[PDB]
Ligand binder design. Structure first.
Ligand code: NA
Ligand code: NA
Ligand code: NA
Ligand code: NA
Lengths: 204, 204, 202, 202
């Protein structure tokens, strides 16, 4: 109904290309131009709170208890603690022991900058770390043997199969619920349509 | 509510400060941060069409009756053809004659800086012209004796009283309806509230 | 024909008015003195939609094809209305304090989103306006705290309508004249010579 | 203890990986190689939130105090999927034509002096993404026409997944290393010496 602009935020763990089917359909449904922006952890939620994002696709988080924010579970994602095959972490009797983990470099994706608070990986103080902005940069660092870190399984599935990466220990494997969140204090055609279409991209 | 952002566009003829009462009230009604942006003629409407403005306050225009756009008349504004007291245009028998107007410099508000003629005296081809972006710059140019142009009466009322400007000829005085316009394809709390409050600013 | 000078919002357009009559005699050139905000001024120069830009010294243009010359220095003062509570603050410039009070921004290239001067924190209230005058009126009405060009508020501070929040935040900015070297028309060349003369000793 | 290098989106972060082990031996410094887009990279430097910036050329100072050095040249190519109708176009770069086809933009963290890597026109359909990878995937999927860094699509062009729209639009950009002189830590100094060595021959 004349040109419109909707802004979807996909957190770093969420593949942006999964939302590409929406683009053509949104151009036919309305005259709506899509913006699918990437943010990291709390940065995704912050965008929603500050009213700078129509819909957020992100891991379930403590922010969700907000009264004017609706939310719905989309799918589950698996996180695996990986390292390059030749990394010494593999020869460790107790790779997840606090005494062992400090010996080896962790790799973190920043949310705004170097931020100690993280839940995916418990980086310890005095432990070496590398910090990057993108999930791809983190992958390349891991492929190059530069540290040990958690990754979304889809992004490293081929890597593990083809022996470029190796799961450090299955004990650390975690499941994260990926949720769709939005604010009820505003509504439009395009936003409503997306809220209905996005779940269809995944389960049903 | 938590933070929200609304964008009101006020066309150059419309004093932005008239919307200042909204600011404090909008901070209490919701957590909404206001942006009152100035545009010139068609630029104001273009923002509305492109979905880059929640509400537009602008002169009534050829854009109107557009199917997705609601509108409401707010008030009438008077436009006066003025020049500095010492300007030779005052000594002219026929100041508004095509033969006369070409002799003297017109002043236009634009961004494009090429095509002025829209709704009023306008600028004749081959006529000397100065182009400025703001209504204030146009006022100063007129005060400095540099040309002849239309101005919104409120902005030059004191100038005419105190003999800094002088109405060239009353024949050219025109009335413009200032309307509030928005798009129906979207709605939220703040937007709805403003659509109700803005007319109240101009009751009297 | 047609010359376009772009004066950034901080730069008073009327300072260029002396050029108008002279340019009409020197050449048959019709002048446009267009106002833009921050990056919008430079963008016009890059896109070849402005012959000369008068603007604060700033990043970009890929460091290709842009000549520049310093015209004068401008002082920027952090001001607020006399009765604004920011004045009673022990630490008015502390991040903990600044968040309490509304900032006021002039939107850049004339749009809401492009606003990255500085001084605005998350969770901080803000108002965004298009013009430096609108920002002045907002400040006069007590609606926030913001930086202003000293010349535009000098009388305001004298006559007690505004008050400098803290001198520590005062900054000096070089106002430069910039153009592209890939063209040198008659009118353009003449203006490049005349414009510095408008500001001599300043 | 903590050094922050900012690499603009056009710059491959992994090119700086050799530094990591050496920096751990040289000093006890934990490295952050952060990605930003266009002006967002510079803004970090101005706000003192980045020790070193690797980014497309600016060379211009509002914030002042900035030293810079050229590292290497990068080529940008206007590409689209092989089956995109832009290829059948007589005049693919004509303003009349470009509006017909969707542009793809990487969003910026700052005052958008660079907004269009090539040029995005009003009324023109657009998709906006945050990352250069997302933009690549969009292009691979046939969803628009946009500029890309040649190294990132060299294999794509070879293996017929992408195709250069027109060579006329190809542009060369200097990638520079920039920093502020008002500080000179051990690690920062060492990196400023090592980083140029990573791009000998380039
Ligand atoms: Na992304
Ligand atoms: Na105004
Ligand atoms: Na001006
Ligand atoms: Na990167």
């Amino acid at each position: 109904h004349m040109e419109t602009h909707l802004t979807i935020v996909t957190e770093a763990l969420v593949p942006t290309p999964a939302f590409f089917p929406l683009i053509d359909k949104l151009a036919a449904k309305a005259n709506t131009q899509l913006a699918i922006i990437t943010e990291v952890l709390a940065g995704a939620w912050e965008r929603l709170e500050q009213g700078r994002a129509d819909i957020v696709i992100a891991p379930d988080m403590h922010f969700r208890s907000s009264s004017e924010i609706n939310s719905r579970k989309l799918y589950t994602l698996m996180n695996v603690y990986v390292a390059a095959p030749d990394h010494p972490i593999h020869q460790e009797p107790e790779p997840l022991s606090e005494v062992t983990r400090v010996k080896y470099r962790g790799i973190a994706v920043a949310d705004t900058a170097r931020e100690r608070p993280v839940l995916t990986v418990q980086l310890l103080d005095k432990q070496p770390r590398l910090t990057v902005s993108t999930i791809e940069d983190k992958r390349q660092a891991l492929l190059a043997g530069l540290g040990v870190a958690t990754m979304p399984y889809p992004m490293v599935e081929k890597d593990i199969a083809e022996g470029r990466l190796r799961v450090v220990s299955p004990e650390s494997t975690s499941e994260i619920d990926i949720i769709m969140a939005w604010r009820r204090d505003s509504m439009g055609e395009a936003k409503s349509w997306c809220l209905r279409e996005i779940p269809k991209l995944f389960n049903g």
